[PDB]
Amino acid sequence: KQEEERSKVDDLRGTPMSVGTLEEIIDDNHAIVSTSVGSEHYVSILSFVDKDLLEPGCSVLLNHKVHAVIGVLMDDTDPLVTVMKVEKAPQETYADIGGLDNQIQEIKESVELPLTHPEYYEEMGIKPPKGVILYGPPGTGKTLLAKAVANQTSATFLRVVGSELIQKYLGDGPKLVRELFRVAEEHAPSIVFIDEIDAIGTKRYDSNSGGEREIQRTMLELLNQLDGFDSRGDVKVIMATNRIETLDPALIRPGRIDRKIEFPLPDEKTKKRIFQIHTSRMTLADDVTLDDLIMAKDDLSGADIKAICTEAGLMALRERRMKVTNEDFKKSKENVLYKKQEGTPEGLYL
């Protein structure tokens, strides 16, 4: 039966089996096999697995003793495959409209609509945007928008931190670039997101060789693999920073990165929805006016709205009061915002 011949192939397999990289097809079914250290006898292949699945120079299943080619490889999994491949569409498409409302449309019709409906480009002959940078003040919504398009997705979403690629072994970074874009290739049209790559410029590290000539090579592999060859087709890639100065302009140049999208701090019309929805789930003495908080602070982030709208509940619930007086918003905003440069030292502005 097939269990007997299958067990015979299993007995061709000697239980310590190794994993080694091919170099070249030697066409007459005896091959020559590199290990990680490359001890390469003229070994043969177990001739029931398909030899013609693999290109030359691809990893296989081997033996220790005779080193004979036994089986086919499956994948490569690192601590990054767990993190690069996002498992679920996590959460938070939006809990509050009124965050930005401007570049929401821009990321929507720039990223979502060419992806979700790629038939407009037939009508007009337009290429899709390949690289878009999302950058500005810290904690604007950029990471939150990455989790938005992560949740409101249509693709195999990929989440990458830019500092994941930093190793001490030689070539290890570009190897994880190759596994990286292999992941970016072989699922479906996937949304790659890469964040905090403004912290790859003036950066020197401990677990490292010669610093100026290590990550130059890895980022060089990013420049070659990212938007050089290997036909983009439909592979969405979105990166994000906070600053711009350490950016090598060789990737900033078009072809590679197409759209550079800033982020302002929100205006008072959009503030009211963030103030309101951050207060949508709390007991509040509604006689107080949020418009003092909406008017007063001029360059708030939404974390300032968050911190005040939690902090006033820390001041009312500090004394077991379910609803919040206006002076708890006073101590709230004066507790959040510190070192208000108004008078004292110079205050030349008066």
Partner: protein
């Protein structure tokens, strides 16, 4: 403050200290206490003490309601008979008597089965009419008709909150989670308050579930009182089932009040704005007549390509494309092409006669039988294409008019469906009495009388379908009969609310899995869907049955059951191995808006090797999207480039470019792995406008 003055007040059992302490504790009952009621352990000794003892009940339910109790908490308030927009009223009425009265209504609703819970329940109804917060208190007082007098108790001023909010969440949760019988207390008292209200089609959505004849007369005297007009004619005809436009055309044939509701609500006036404006506002190009029509000739994909060109409907151009397209065609493809003209012509009543008349009474049996089939396709309000076929029908074994019985009996089933229309069925008694070895005689018998017989008054086990049960069990040959007869049997089970017809056929029919497969067919068609998990987990169990065809329909029941709470509809049916199960989910996608996880399942389901399952993917694939659309088309072009592959290719090219009328014919299409005679019945699946 400090409890040193006020904590020793519980220690004397003197009456005046209690009867001025309890108003003082009522004064400090605005915050409950200073704390989380540390008085509890010293005042449960005072349980045994009895002048102003209902105030002591207010104290007792206040502290027992303050910590925890499921039955002893509302026990003082049912002894108190509540006596003596506030924060205190937000305490002791809103939340304390919300959860307290809610566990009294739940605990007595599950315990006994009095009127004290009716009086306190209407007191909480009135009290939440004071507090005026819906979408909570409502779903609490659903459990506690009672809900009927709640709806006429509450619907005075706020219309859209109770209608949109309460009818949305309670209709959706009532088809989702709540079982059937309280739903009619939905369907009738929502009939009542919307009787007081405008925006009539919500009542017509009540007509989607009631199937009642009084509401359509009330909505026609009312929808004539509110004079768009032909628009509610259109979704009147799309919303109605097969029974109530014949009952509607007789109860409106008597009075009619303008005689325009007779012209609208049978036929002939839903399509008259459509088809000229279909020509007007839209413009289709000749490059799909030719370009999708340039798919090469094998006299099979020329047949199916002429069928795709039959579904182009900038005019009826394929009707008059000369000759020798049907001359190269074979028999059931001559059924396909002789009925192809009517599929271009789901309008043009007088023009249908002068286009089919060339192919009427012709030299070929399939030209005339498919021609009368097209006469069944074109319209539903003529009854003048009855007599050229209806008199011919009687053949007694295997003559021409039997094949016209293939075309017209189903076509008259396409044309008319009464309450129980019977002259066609008295014609059907020698049709099933014929019992031709051609399958589609009894096929369109069961399916056509089922099209008359869907939407019935909880079905019927009348001698029509009982006759085809016994005469079904007469001969056990050609098991498509054992498959396509419980088709129309289950169609006559439709219109059910409470059908024990599954038990009746479970007594009469059951045997070896031809008729146990009839048992699983009635198990499908009589159990349309509610919050009914007990047969869903039974769905889990008999999924593991050794007979692999009752799995097909029995698990195919999914998209009928859970069509609304569609998040559960992705399951592991692809992850199973009983290869027709992948076909079952491949049915269970459907024809709707076509979300991203659907096509994500069509990535893997697109790629499979058996031409039955690979033939089963492009139908629902391109059916759910009626490049983006042509990207899976050229993907199938990459899949193949047998003739089954080119036929599924023409199937996707076809489909690319709870109403009962769209529910039958794909469930009729569930036995595809067979002759082109069955593919002659492939050209019947009319479900689109």
């Amino acid at each position: 403050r400090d409890k040193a003055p006020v904590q020793p007040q519980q220690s004397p059992a003197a009456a005046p200290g209690g009867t001025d302490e309890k108003p003082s504790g009522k004064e400090r009952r605005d915050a409950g206490d200073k704390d989380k009621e540390q008085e509890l352990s010293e005042e449960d000794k005072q349980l045994q003490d009895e002048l102003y003892r209902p105030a002591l009940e207010e104290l007792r339910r206040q502290i027992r309601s303050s910590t925890t109790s499921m039955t002893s908490v509302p026990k003082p308030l049912k002894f108190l008979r509540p006596h003596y927009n506030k924060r205190f009223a937000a305490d002791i009425i809103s939340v304390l008597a919300m959860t307290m009265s809610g566990e009294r209504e739940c605990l007595k609703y599950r315990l006994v089965g009095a009127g004290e819970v009716a009086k306190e329940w209407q007191e909480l109804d009135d009290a939440e009419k004071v507090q005026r917060e819906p979408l909570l208190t409502l779903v609490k007082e659903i459990v506690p008709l009672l809900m009927e007098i709640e709806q006429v108790d509450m619907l005075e001023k706020d219309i859209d909150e109770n209608a949109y909010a309460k009818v949305c969440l309670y209709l959706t949760s009532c088809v989702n989670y709540v079982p059937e019988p309280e739903n009619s207390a939905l369907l009738r008292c929502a009939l009542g308050v919307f009787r007081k209200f405008s925006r009539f089609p919500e009542a017509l959505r009540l007509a989607l579930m009631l199937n009642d004849m009084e509401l359509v007369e009330d909505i026609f005297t009312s929808c004539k009182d509110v004079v768009m007009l032909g628009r509610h004619g259109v979704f009147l005809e799309l919303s109605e089932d097969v029974e109530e436009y014949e009952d509607l055309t007789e109860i409106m044939s008597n009075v009619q009040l303008n005689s325009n509701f007779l012209a609208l609500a049978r036929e002939l006036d839903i399509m008259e704005p459509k088809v000229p404006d279909d020509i007007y506002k839209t413009h289709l190009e000749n490059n799909r007549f030719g370009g999708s029509g340039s798919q090469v000739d094998s006299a099979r994909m020329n047949l199916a390509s002429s069928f795709v060109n039959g579904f182009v409907n900038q005019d009826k151009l394929l009707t008059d494309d000369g000759n020798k397209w049907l001359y190269k065609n074979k028999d059931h493809g001559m059924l396909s092409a002789a009925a192809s003209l009517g599929m271009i012509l789901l309008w043009d009543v007088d023009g249908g006669l002068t286009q089919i008349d060339k192919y009427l009474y012709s030299s070929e049996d399939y030209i005339k039988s498919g021609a009368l089939l097209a006469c069944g396709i074109v319209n539903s309000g003529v009854r003048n294409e009855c007599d050229p076929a209806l008199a011919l029908l009687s053949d007694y074994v295997l003559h021409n008019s039997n094949t016209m019985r293939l075309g017209s009996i189903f076509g008259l089933g396409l044309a008319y469906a009464g309450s129980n229309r019977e002259d066609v069925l008295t014609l059907l008694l020698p049709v099933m009495g014929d019992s031709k070895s051609s399958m589609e005689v009894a096929g369109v018998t069961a399916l056509a009388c089922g099209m008359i017989a869907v939407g019935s008054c909880n079905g019927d086990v009348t001698s029509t379908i009982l006759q085809t049960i016994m005469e079904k069990s007469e001969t056990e040959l050609k098991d498509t009969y054992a498959r396509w007869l419980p088709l129309g049997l289950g169609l006559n089970h439709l219109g059910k609310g409470e059908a024990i017809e599954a038990i009746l056929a479970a007594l009469e029919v059951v045997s070896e899995p031809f008729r146990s497969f009839a048992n699983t067919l009635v198990d499908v068609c009589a159990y349309a869907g509610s919050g009914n998990v007990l047969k869903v987990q039974q769905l889990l169990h008999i999924c593991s049955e050794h007979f692999d065809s009752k799995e097909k329909e029995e698990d195919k029941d999914k998209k009928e059951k859970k069509d609304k709470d569609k998040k559960e509809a992705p399951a592991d049916m692809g992850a199973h191995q009983g290869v027709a199960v992948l076909g079952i989910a491949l049915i269970a996608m459907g024809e709707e808006i076509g979300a991203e996880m659907a096509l994500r399942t069509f990535g893997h389901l697109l790629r499979y090797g058996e031409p039955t399952l690979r033939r089963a993917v492009p139908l629902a694939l391109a059916l759910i999207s009626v490049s983006h659309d042509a990207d899976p088309e050229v993907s199938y072009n990459s899949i193949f480039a047998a003739r089954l592959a080119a036929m599924l290719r023409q199937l996707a090219q076809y489909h690319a470019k709870k109403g009962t009328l769209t529910l039958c014919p794909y469930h009729s299409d569930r036995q595809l792995m067979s002759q082109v005679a069955v593919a002659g019945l492939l050209t019947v699946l009319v479900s689109f406008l």
